[PDB]
Design an enzyme around this catalytic site. Sequence first.
Site, mmCIF file in Angstrom:
data_model
loop_
_atom_site.group_PDB
_atom_site.id
_atom_site.type_symbol
_atom_site.label_atom_id
_atom_site.label_comp_id
_atom_site.label_asym_id
_atom_site.label_seq_id
_atom_site.Cartn_x
_atom_site.Cartn_y
_atom_site.Cartn_z
ATOM 1 N N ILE A 1 0.876 -1.197 -0.055
ATOM 2 C CA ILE A 1 -0.038 0.174 0.068
ATOM 3 C C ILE A 1 0.649 1.217 0.225
ATOM 4 O O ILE A 1 0.407 2.336 -0.273
ATOM 5 C CB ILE A 1 -0.925 0.003 1.299
ATOM 6 C CG1 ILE A 1 -0.102 -0.286 2.512
ATOM 7 C CG2 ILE A 1 -1.826 -0.967 1.020
ATOM 8 C CD1 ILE A 1 -1.111 -0.108 3.689
ATOM 9 N N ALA B 1 10.280 6.755 -0.291
ATOM 10 C CA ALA B 1 11.733 6.759 -0.227
ATOM 11 C C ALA B 1 12.099 6.581 1.394
ATOM 12 O O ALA B 1 13.032 6.222 1.621
ATOM 13 C CB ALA B 1 12.192 8.187 -0.552
ATOM 14 N N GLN B 2 10.921 6.533 1.995
ATOM 15 C CA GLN B 2 10.783 6.028 3.361
ATOM 16 C C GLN B 2 11.012 4.656 3.808
ATOM 17 O O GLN B 2 11.913 4.057 4.378
ATOM 18 C CB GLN B 2 9.447 6.504 3.920
ATOM 19 C CG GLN B 2 8.288 5.917 3.196
ATOM 20 C CD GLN B 2 7.022 6.015 3.876
ATOM 21 O OE1 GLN B 2 5.830 5.729 3.221
ATOM 22 N NE2 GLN B 2 6.999 6.309 5.151
ATOM 23 N N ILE C 1 9.204 0.541 1.889
ATOM 24 C CA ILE C 1 7.946 -0.217 1.305
ATOM 25 C C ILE C 1 7.220 -0.570 2.491
ATOM 26 O O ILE C 1 7.368 -0.918 3.632
ATOM 27 C CB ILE C 1 8.258 -1.573 0.578
ATOM 28 C CG1 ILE C 1 9.358 -1.224 -0.481
ATOM 29 C CG2 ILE C 1 6.921 -2.023 -0.175
ATOM 30 C CD1 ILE C 1 9.840 -2.447 -0.855
ATOM 31 N N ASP D 1 7.832 17.453 7.573
ATOM 32 C CA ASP D 1 7.305 16.856 6.563
ATOM 33 C C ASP D 1 5.770 16.527 6.223
ATOM 34 O O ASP D 1 5.399 15.106 6.108
ATOM 35 C CB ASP D 1 8.000 15.330 6.015
ATOM 36 C CG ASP D 1 7.775 14.864 4.735
ATOM 37 O OD1 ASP D 1 7.697 15.419 3.716
ATOM 38 O OD2 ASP D 1 7.210 13.800 4.778
#
Lengths: 10, 357
Positions: free
Chosen positions: B26, B30-31, B33, B145
Amino acid sequence: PKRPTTLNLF
Amino acid sequence: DNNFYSVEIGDSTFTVLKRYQNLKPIGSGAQGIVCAAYDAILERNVAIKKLSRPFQNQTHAKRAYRELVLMKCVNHKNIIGLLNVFTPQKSLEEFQDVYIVMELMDANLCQVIQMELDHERMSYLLYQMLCGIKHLHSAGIIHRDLKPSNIVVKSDCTLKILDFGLARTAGTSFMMEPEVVTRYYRAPEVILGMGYKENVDIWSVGCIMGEMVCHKILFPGRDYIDQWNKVIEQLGTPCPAFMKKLQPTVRNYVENRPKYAGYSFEKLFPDVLFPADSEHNKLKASQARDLLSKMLVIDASKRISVDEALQHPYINVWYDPSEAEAPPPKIPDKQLDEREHTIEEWKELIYKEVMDL
């Protein structure tokens, strides 16, 4: 003035 | 290993202690998967995030770790819930990657930005949102962010913040690497490489609330530099005082831009776009707009504050000390990590920080 309980996201 | 097991997720592998059965991707980021699953034990669906390159380098670490700690150390009804954090490998040596486990909300704020709303609901969601932020802030911690893809909601109408990878404290100097903090929501002080203070987060909550009213993105740049051009075209060119606050180099470019008057907030945000104002006071388009125009402000110095926001005629309608004043989260002071420790030394703090908890 009460807080909502439902949020139709569908 | 024997209790874990890999599954076929995207162009990658996923190893989770069997209890986490039923992996449905989902989140591609870049954080890392991220996919939902059903915890056989907890018996309720959860969210598993695999740290995309924990030690790919000096920065990945400083953040891989920064999130862990912060997920842990911070508890609030509006900050995502940490349920776990496991790792497949067995030795520091083999310590390759870490998967975090946090509660799972129904949908996204993107999903929200795609539906009308009523003052009551919109107002409340911005409240919950300002609440989770007052928390991180109250302990000197900044998110930097806040975009919609980092805000999750539910059919009971609640909200919780997310990703803390960039989450840190005081920008002792310009975000040298805003490259990460997503364009569309980048704050002026971040764009023009200044230095960020607490309220940078409030700029984001500006774009975010503006996107909820327009239903489209507010400052649609086409590159890191064109981003400024959209901010000024709408809000107008910055006074000279501000321009004297820019580094000598940014100054020039910024002053060589065409001059922009900007439109007023009663124009950028006409009534018709705001929920059907009902006879009542507290919840009105006008006040919605007043809050808006107090966040969407180029000069941080002169920009609102969470405490102030949480106290605005549109938000303060459901104030409650138990949420707004709640006790700040307590860090053991692990954020000593400004000191970039070597990948290895890093992998030390990591795997173990991982470990026990």
